[PDB]
């Protein structure tokens, strides 16, 4: 069934989610502890992002690979802000996790506090992302718009990555594993 993940969406999105714009565009941004959030890599902030509508410094951004050097199109980014976000370490899984239901979470200026059933999510693992070979990507079907990266891919009680893409058929998601935020 549904309902619980979007239960479990809805909840999350509201304390740890936010609405960010970069030079290249504007996204969903999850927060995971202390002051570190993840975005899909290529938002590529800058010194300065606009979080919710208010200018926030980013002290730190960590572009992540995997060991073999190849691409995750996950970047973690360190905000300078007072407010730490709730610790969702524990909702991250430790492998790739494949679902049978998923619900992506998208709020933008563009698609304001939007939930999509997406179905099965599978594991590909080892992808080409326009031109970047790319580990980790979980699919799904999706009619994919521009506009909907750093969307949170959740699950029941488990948020299972970031969305870094689509081609108006499938969408894309990074996985999000606990590890990231040792």
Not at 23 to 50: C, N, Q, S
Not at 114 to 121: A, D, F, L, N
Not at 126 to 146: D, E, H, I, Q, S
Request: glycine share 10%; proline share 4%; hydrophobic share 40%.
């Amino acid at each position: 069934m549904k309902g619980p993940a979007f239960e479990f969406a809805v909840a999350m999105m509201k304390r740890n989610a936010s609405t960010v714009k970069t030079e290249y565009g504007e996204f969903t941004m999850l927060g995971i502890y202390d002051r570190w959030a993840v975005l899909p890599r290529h938002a590529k902030p800058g010194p300065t992002i606009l979080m919710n509508d208010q200018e926030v410094g980013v002290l730190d951004a960590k572009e992540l690979v995997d060991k073999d050097g190849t691409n995750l199109e996950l970047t973690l980014l360190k905000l300078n802000r007072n407010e730490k976000f709730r610790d969702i370490r524990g909702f991250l899984a430790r492998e790739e996790v494949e679902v049978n239901e998923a619900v992506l979470a998208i709020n933008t200026s563009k698609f304001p506090n939007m939930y999509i059933p997406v179905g099965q999510v599978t594991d590909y693992g080892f992808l080409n992302l326009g031109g970047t070979p790319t580990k980790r990507m979980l699919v799904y079907n999706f009619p994919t718009r521009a506009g909907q990266c750093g969307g949170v891919l959740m699950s029941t009680g488990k948020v299972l990555g970031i969305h870094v893409g689509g081609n108006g058929h499938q969408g894309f998601s990074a996985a999000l594993l606990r590890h990231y935020f040792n």
